[PDB]
Curated annotation (Swiss-Prot), chains A, B, C, D:
Record family assignment: Belongs to the LecA/PllA lectin family.
Superkingdom to which the source organism belongs: Bacteria
Protein's UniProt keywords contain Magnesium: no
Protein name from the UniProt record: PA-I galactophilic lectin
Gene: lecA
Transmembrane feature ranges: none
Listed GO biological process terms: heterophilic cell-cell adhesion via plasma membrane cell adhesion molecules
Alphabetized GO MF terms: carbohydrate binding
GO cellular component terms, A-Z: cell surface; cytoplasm; periplasmic space
Length: 121, 121, 121, 121
C-alpha cells in the first residue's frame, strides 16, 4: 500500500509507489482541504460551482483530486475509488495531481491525504 | 459488500447489510453532494466553517457522513475509511447517517453514494 | 489472521483465535508431517489407502487435518481451503483437529503448521 | 484467480493465467495425489525421505509441487503459499510443475488441483 500527501501547489503531482498492472483492483481514499487560490478550501471533489478555464482534467471540478496511470490522460479520483479496475491498456505508476489550470498552481494551498492499496482478485 | 445512498434528510440514517464483528477490517468510500439547509452543497467531509449547535457527531463537521456500529456513538466517516478497525467493544450493523442537529433534517437535500466492504484480515 | 501448529496426538484439538462469523470468507493453508501410529508420516490430506475405523471425520482420510467451527460437526481441511464460506448456521471459534479414531491419539506423532485468514467480502 | 490441474508426468508443467508482478501478494492452495514412479502416492509436499537425484527444484522434495514466475528458477509451492511475496524480483506468468528429475517423468502418474489468487497488498 501507499500513504502520502498531495500538495495543491505541486503542478507535477505526487508520484506514488503503486504500479498499476493489468487486472489489478485498487482502492483509493482521499481526505483533506485545499484551495486553488481563494481563501475558501474544498475537499477532494473540488469546487462544484467553478467554471473550467483549461483544467488538466475536464471530467473533475477545479480543486478535485485526479491521477495519471503511466502514460494515461488524467482520470478523476475525487474522494476515492472502491475496488476499481482501470480501463484496458492503462498501466504504470500512479501519479496523484491536484486539478488546476497549468501555470496557476503557485497560489494554491493545503493538501490531500491519500491511501492507495491493491485488492483481492 | 454494501453499495447505496445515504439521504441527507433521513434522520434515522441508512441501516446497511454490513455486520461489523470484532477484528473485522473495513473499507468505506463516500462521494457526492448534500446540504443541511443552505443553498450551497458540501461533500462528505461537510462544511468546515459551520458551528456545532448540537450535531449527532461532534467529531465531524455539519453535513459530514458519519456512522454507528450497532448502538455505538457516532463515528466520523467523511470521505471514507481505509482498511479500518473499530474501537474495542464496538460491533453490530453499520448505520450510515448525515451529520445534522436532531429535529432539523427536514430541510436537508442531496445524498452521498457509499460503498462498504470487508477487507482481508 | 492466525498461525500455529496442531499436534497429531492432541485429541481435543487446537483452538485458534479465529471466530468464524456469518458471511465470512476464509483461507487456510496447512503443511507438515504427522502419523496416526505407523513409522511413516503423511501430509495434511492423510493416508488415502487407510480404511476408516471410526474416524472423527468420515469425509477425510485418516491423518488428515479437519476442523470444527464452534460446536459444528467436523469439516475437512486437508491442505487448506481457498476463499471458502462455511455451511448454514455454522459460527464460532475454529478448532483444528487431526483425524484419527477417538481413544487412539496416544501413539500419534508430528504436527501440521496452519495459517488461517479472513478474505474480502 | 486461477483454478486448474498440473500433471505429474508433464516436464513442461501447466502455464496459468496469473501474471505475478513485483509487490504482488498471492495465495496458493494445492491438493491431490501423485507419484514419481513407485506404487505409493504422495501429496503436494512430495516424499520427505527421497534423495535428490537431480530434481528441477533442490529446495523441495521429489514429488512436490513447485513453480516458476516467468523464466525464474523453481520455487517451492508444496501444499500452498499463504499471503506470499516473491523473494527475488521475479515477474511473469506462473507455471506450475511437478518436482522430478528431467528425463524420468515417463513413469509418473496423478496430478494436483491448484487454486491461485492475488491478495490485498
Ligand atoms: O456560482 C457561484 C455562486 O453560486 C453558488 C454558490 C454557492 C452555492 C450555490 C451557488 N460561485 C461564486 C460566484 C461567482 C461565479 N463567477 C463566475 C465564475 N468565476 C470566475 O470567473 C473565476 C475565475 C477564476 C477564479 S480564481 C482562479 O482560478 C483559476 C482556475 O480557474 C486558477 O487556479 C487561478 O490561480 C485562481 O486564482 C475565481 C473565479 N464568479 N463569481 C460564489 O458563490 N462566490 C463565493 C465564493 O465561493
Ligand atoms: C451573525 C451571525 N451570523 C451567522 C451565524 N451562523 C449560524 O449560527 C447559522 C446556523 C445555522 C444555519 S443553517 C441551519 O443549520 C442547522 C445546523 O446547525 C440545521 O441544519 C438547520 O436545519 C439549518 O437551517 C446557518 C447559520 N451572521 N451574522
Ligand atoms: O525403508 C527404506 C530403506 O530400506 C532399507 C534399505 C536397505 C537396508 C535396510 C532397509 N526406505 C525409506 C526411505 C528412503 C530411503 N531412500 C534411499 C533409497 N532409495 C532410493 O535411492 C530411491 C531412488 C529412486 C527411486 S524411484 C525413482 O525416482 C527418481 C527420482 O529420484 C525418478 O522419478 C524415477 O523415475 C523413479 O523411478 C526410489 C528409491 N529413499 N527413501 C522409505 O520411506 N521407503 C518407503 C516405505 O516407507
Ligand atoms: Ca491556482
Ligand atoms: Ca438541516
Ligand atoms: Ca493413532
Ligand atoms: Ca519419475
Amino acid at each position: 500500500a501507499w500513504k502520502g500527501e498531495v500538495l495543491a501547489n505541486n503542478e507535477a503531482g505526487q508520484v506514488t509507489s503503486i504500479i498499476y498492472n493489468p487486472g489489478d483492483v485498487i482502492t483509493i481514499v482521499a481526505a483533506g482541504w485545499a484551495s486553488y487560490g481563494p481563501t475558501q478550501k474544498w475537499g477532494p471533489q473540488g469546487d462544484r460551482e467553478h467554471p473550467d478555464q483549461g483544467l488538466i482534467c475536464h471530467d473533475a471540478f477545479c480543486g478535485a483530486l485526479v491521477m495519471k496511470i503511466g502514460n494515461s490522460g488524467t482520470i478523476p479520483v475525487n474522494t476515492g475509488l472502491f475496488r476499481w479496475v482501470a480501463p484496458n491498456n492503462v498501466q504504470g505508476a500512479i501519479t496523484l495531481i491536484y486539478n488546476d489550470v497549468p501555470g496557476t498552481y503557485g497560489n494554491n494551498s493545503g493538501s490531500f491525504s491519500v491511501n492507495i492499496g491493491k485488492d483481492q482478485s
